[PDB]
Symmetry: C5
Subunit: 316 residues, 5 copies
């Protein structure tokens, strides 16, 4: 039998081993944009056929995890894993199940940290297509062929997963063929699109900015004769805009090097406030008309620009 053949894959020499995969994401622990990765716990299930491990019977038997050290198991590995570990809570979280016809069920609880590149250009409404790829580290396509057990039904838990900030709406599984120097491999890629919620940032960041712009508009009505009111409203507007900029800049650490969307909108609001103050100063200098015309020109142009920005960042 397979005494010292545990190093030899089933059908050592000839047809490769067809391993069917099943994934069950118990929970996506975190999604770090600063480190550009995601930590998630998965229930990796693999099913192959070992002709040397067959027996006479009708039913299957669940064996201890310590038997894994005596049998052959596929060298499955996450392609873009930075740090992963099999859970050892009480014993090794390994399920091994031997079947009559040779089927071997191998289940593991793996907490993995996969790095998916994130483009934060449309940061408030960005959709990140993050992938979890499983491949054989040592055995190429001529030795191990990885396959999905039930297509897109193989992966479970992603449909009902609701993260803190993101939400999976479209996930699917593919059987790609990776071409490396050592050889050709069959890679199983489960890719899912994480879309951040849109309402939170609007009601918590965009609404205060709109209120600041409204206060800047109101600042036009107050004239220079009432210097206390003008000074107070200007101080409040400037201080609130500075605090809003600070709060927006402190949400995400200085790690990204792209042009964001919330930053552009806040810069537009700050530029509008600065231009309003500069126009008030210029009107005062010229007087010692324009303000009345601005009181009607600013709302229409500002609303049109806001609609243009929204149409640009939602549709095209």
């Amino acid at each position: 039998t397979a005494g010292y053949n545990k190093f030899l894959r089933p059908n050592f020499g000839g047809e490769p081993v067809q391993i069917a995969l099943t994934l069950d994401i118990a929970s996506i622990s975190s999604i770090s944009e600063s480190n550009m990765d995601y930590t998630a716990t998965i229930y990796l299930r693999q099913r192959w056929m070992d002709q040397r491990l067959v027996f006479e019977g009708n039913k299957s038997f669940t064996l201890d995890a310590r038997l894994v050290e005596f049998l052959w198991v596929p060298d499955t590995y996450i392609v873009e894993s930075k740090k992963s570990f099999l859970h050892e809570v009480t014993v090794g979280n390994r399920l091994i199940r031997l079947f009559s016809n040779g089927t071997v069920l191998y289940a593991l609880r793996i907490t993995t940290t996969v790095a998916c590149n994130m483009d934060l250009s449309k940061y408030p409404m960005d959709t990140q297509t993050c992938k979890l790829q499983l491949e054989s580290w040592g055995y190429d396509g001529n030795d191990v062929e990885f396959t999905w057990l039930r297509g897109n039904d193989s992966v479970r838990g992603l449909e009902h997963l609701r993260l803190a900030q993101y939400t999976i709406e479209r996930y699917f599984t593919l059987v790609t063929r990776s071409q490396q120097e050592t050889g050709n491999y069959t890679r199983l890629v489960l890719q899912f699109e994480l879309r951040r919620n849109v309402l939170y940032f609007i009601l918590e960041t965009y609404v205060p900015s709109t209120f600041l712009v409204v206060l800047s508009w109101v600042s036009f009505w107050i004239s220079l004769d009432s210097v206390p009111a003008r000074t107070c409203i200007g101080v409040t507007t400037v201080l609130s805009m500075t605090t809003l900029m600070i709060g927006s800049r402190t949400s995400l650490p200085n790690t990204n090097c792209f042009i964001k969307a919330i930053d552009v909108y806040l810069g537009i609001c700050f530029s509008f406030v600065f231009g309003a103050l500069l126009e008030y100063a210029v009107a005062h200098y010229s007087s010692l008309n324009v303000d009345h015309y601005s009181k009607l020109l600013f709302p229409l142009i500002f609303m049109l620009a806001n609609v243009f920005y929204w149409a640009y960042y939602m549709y095209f």
Copy 2:
């Protein structure tokens, strides 16, 4: 005897193994709302019957932990564990106790990090029903049946536990039947309701906000003739409200994406201050009556709104 049968569960083929469970939470190390989990140390005790491990005698014997590697132990596992480890202080923290009739006592010190979903909508008075679920990773309900030794007496230490911010008032144990693709499992769920203290946030955050609103009310009495006093009181009110908002927003990191309760109350206070300032400005503009009427209208309506908010967030 069970020479190589340590991989075989007791009564391998036929009736399952009835394992009685006992829990003893020594300490809940932390409760992280940002990561939405809790780290706690538990004294997991399991009792089953091994017919192959029986002997002739009357008394029980405590064996070394290293004997665990030679016997069969259940593959108990925490369902929602992110990171757990058996303590190795001097030796492996394992108690194995063999009995005359076949009873096996298996005790472990496990520091586990279980993720329980937290809803922070009523954040100052939120009650989180966090669960600790134990299940067999490999053996289904037809092989291992998990049971509580003494019902709700089995779990000890939760009644006398007093955390820093929370307090357990109602905890109970259930025997649920989890239906997975591999098979049906008997899960033991100890769920406990953690209720945060109510007085600390009221006396440290709500009271300063009430004092700020009182100062805003007092600002009405001071007229425009004394510009220094009005300027000082307005500056103090605005600066204090901004600092209070900053302190409230820095307590919890930017991880939750829900509408909180302390945020709503602080926003109401900020809106009241802003409306008071705007009404003062409008009254000054109209004069160059309303303030006297407001001095009587504001207290009653404000108190009624506060009572309505309290009744909404305490009862229904």
Copy 3:
């Protein structure tokens, strides 16, 4: 001999093993009030008698640490340890010493993190009685009896330890009997009282608050005729008190949920400043006497209140 009896404790069946303990705290690495624990390195020494490990001779012999895997060692464990590890610098930091009459010396370097509950009510002058408890995880009092080798002598290094913020003044060792569900255990508890230094917080936090209150007192002498000086002194007082409050609140993270002592004193100072400003405003309103009477009333009452607070928080 004890071929496979390494799993069997000495005198397996009958009188228990009397293990004498010796502790040597090399350094208390940290004392975290936010996590409510302390990390310290200890030189754990255990001495028992193994009748099966006796030989003919007169002298003792130091054996390699790898021999520990072949002998029986007590399952000593820290009762409230959150994370501990035996040091592996070059080899395993284990001293095993075999003696002629059967004495076995077992020394380990253990960096442990013990959680001791901290009451921060009198935070500037709090004394925390933190304990380090050693117990047998598996063997009860009928199998292993833990004893202190030399009573309060046994523990060394605590008398000469001077931490950054604390100072041990009274430490002692007790032999308690813990009653658990599994059985009764002999626990060795070394408890030490850590007292924080009193002068640092007085000279760095209380003195600036006293200077702020003195400046608030001086603010009474300046009249309303010199509006620049009054405005400057008021701005300086308010800004300094806000900065002092911020610095006091940022020293300890938002983890405790108790009423502190430094917070109470700073709140008293802030209330005094606010009351001084309010009284100045009320006197100005009434004039358009009281201030002169206050200039004499405030010092005596303030000093008496400070003495009462000091007597309350030092003696009773």
Copy 4:
């Protein structure tokens, strides 16, 4: 055969083992300037010839990773590694491939943290030449000779790598000879120049500073007759410059002890603002001409100084 000769290197005594190396940087996880290191995942491939491991055949065979414990593998090590670990996702990420003529392919997934010294003098445009050096820890040049399989081809993935803040433009591999006390070693050094992006810091930090200097220039046009406008513009300029300095100083922790470039430019801008304010004060004192001459002198000299600084920090 090589029964106990796994401790003996191939050709034990005589000609050394020629090991050909291949590197494949899957991802550079992080580049920490505060800790002055970089964490990256590499696919280390080694090819040597074991005369004792030859067999009769024509094709190669991929063996299990557990066979590595039975064969001889080179003691390759990263020279400046602070913390590294071979990935264990499902099994040990080891590829072992035995060939007919004796070639042995050994592939490992290693996440390493190499410390490369960073000179942050020209911090916005600094180019760091960070190295990854592989050497034999035990076997000197007379026992193991490390060689690159394909010269600069050998390393793959660096050309297409685009980090968050840096960009590799020139990387190359060298075979150096390290002279140590124990012996002479053949070190394989892959050194790559990481150049930080230039546009982000200009458009996000330098542009606000330029706008602040422009506002300071505009402050000259406003005269002392309009004290509200002058006070507002001065307050805005000072507050904005302080906030910009704070934001620049909070980007990098207080770890470097060098004279940076962004700090010098921001200090120049702050000195310009302070000198403008001082000159305005001096002109007011002298009046109770210079400002008109300054309105023309400042732009030319400021632009020339900026061009000189740019030429200094880009070319020489």
Copy 5:
């Protein structure tokens, strides 16, 4: 031969083993004053004579690291290590070299974290004499005698090490005799004096404070007639001094409980500014002479006090 004698030290019974030590600090990774320790990577080399490991020959042979598990190696350990680990990059970073006459070379790459007590009284110019002590954990002076191979030449890399903030100027090695309860041990202590750079803190913290004091001096020239200029200069001075105090207090976390030197100097500057403001207020009150006399008295006394402070904190 030494079949089971690997637990027995060479010359088991009689003369002790003379182990010659060699140190090579590859890099001091960090020096944490908050935790009062330093993390550094060392190349620990030990040379002893094993009479049972001799063979017939003329040359030495480098054996695999896995042979270490079969031989006897000294139980060297860092006396004040909080956390250390032998590097496992590809294999165990162990060099074992057997010689003809019995010499055994044992080299290890150890990243260690040694706690050296730090006195931050003269914090800007503090010199910390931090030690790295190596001792035998189990074998006393009658079993293992640790010796330096070449005295001060034994340690390499410290002379050319230039850290971020510190600089080693005087390091030396000593053979001390530690007296413990178990026995007397030969400890090898390499102690080095780390001196922080003096110019960085002067040009980045002391220079802004001096500029603030200069601005406070200039504030005397401006009279009360120009209230805008006086208000602006006072606001700038107070705000800049507060920001400088905040920046100085945020450099080091609230962990030390000593009287620093930079804190004393900044407090002196703050007291000077406060006294200048108080003297201006008192002069204004008395007028409604002193300022002219102060304009000459302040520079000389301030310079003399600064020189006295410098002489105190540099020489005696």
